[PDB]
Design a protein around this ligand. Structure first.
Ligand SMILES: Nc1ncnc2c1ncn2[C@@H]1O[C@H](COP(=O)(O)OP(=O)(O)O)[C@@H](O)[C@H]1O
Ligand SMILES: Nc1ncnc2c1ncn2[C@@H]1O[C@H](COP(=O)(O)O)[C@@H](O)[C@H]1O
Length: 214
């Protein structure tokens, strides 16, 4: 099974990607996670993203397409995968099509602009695994600690209000058009498309996704 998660920053994509990985046994391919990791390690493919992410801007289509292709070509993706935060532009989607990377489900997480900044204020992450928490809405079992490793959680460098604002503008300019794009793909019978209400509690969004996917 191959899945794309679509939606504004803070919609709940990374959170639900974890559940889907656990339930359906497919890997989460998060271009944000990969680029952050590339910057941290100084990997030649992706270290270039540091300043661009800090500005809340999208990195080049070229760079992330390469990252995704490398990840996909590996073993653990042979039998399905979930793309979380990719594609982010129509050229990225077209590159998938040209490379014959079709998908089974596109899942649109719908959350009002107004919930985004406030929501992301509370985001804390465990960078080694990609696990995401919220100090109020989805807390770790021990305050400030990852549930698995017990390591102190961090705040993403791009998760401050001003940067989130810039990211949302970029989302509407470049990324929102993927809703139309994939809706048209679904009308052509190339994928299934479903929209979920991302304002519901984490557990309810999870149950809504299970109904669609199961
Ligand atoms: N349905 C939800 N209701 C409230 N908070 C949520 C929900 N889903 C995720 N969150 C929290 O809001 C923040 C953004 O969620 P995340 O899954 O990281 O969004 P995205 O990956 O789409 O940017 C995270 O801190 C997360 O813990
Ligand atoms: N598919 C992508 N295309 C372009 N830039 C990306 C992509 N994925 C992540 N980024 C960059 O990484 C940041 C964080 O992405 P994310 O973790 O999905 O929120 C974005 O604001 C961009 O700067």
């Amino acid at each position: 099974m191959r899945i794309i998660l679509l939606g504004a920053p803070g919609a709940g994509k990374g959170t639900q990607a974890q559940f889907i990985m656990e339930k359906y046994g497919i890997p989460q391919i998060s271009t944000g996670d990969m680029l952050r990791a590339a910057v941290k390690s100084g990997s030649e493919l992706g270290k270039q993203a540091k300043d661009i992410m800090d500005a809340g801007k999208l990195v080049t289509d070229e760079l992330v397409i390469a990252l995704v292709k490398e990840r996909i070509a590996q073993e653990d993706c042979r039998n399905g995968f979930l793309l979380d935060g990719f594609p982010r532009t129509i050229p990225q989607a077209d590159a998938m099509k040209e490379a014959g990377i079709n998908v089974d489900y596109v899942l649109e997480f719908d959350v009002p602009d107004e919930l985004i900044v406030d929501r992301i204020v509370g985001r804390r992450v465990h960078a080694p695994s990609g696990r995401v928490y919220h100090v109020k809405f989805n807390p770790p079992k021990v305050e400030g600690k990852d549930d698995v490793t017990g390591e102190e959680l961090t705040t993403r460098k791009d998760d401050q209000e001003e940067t989130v604002r810039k990211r949302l503008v970029e989302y509407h300019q470049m990324t929102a058009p993927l809703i139309g794009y994939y809706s048209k793909e679904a009308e052509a019978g190339n994928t299934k498309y479903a929209k979920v209400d991302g304002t519901k509690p984490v557990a309810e969004v999870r149950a809504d996704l299970e109904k669609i996917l199961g």
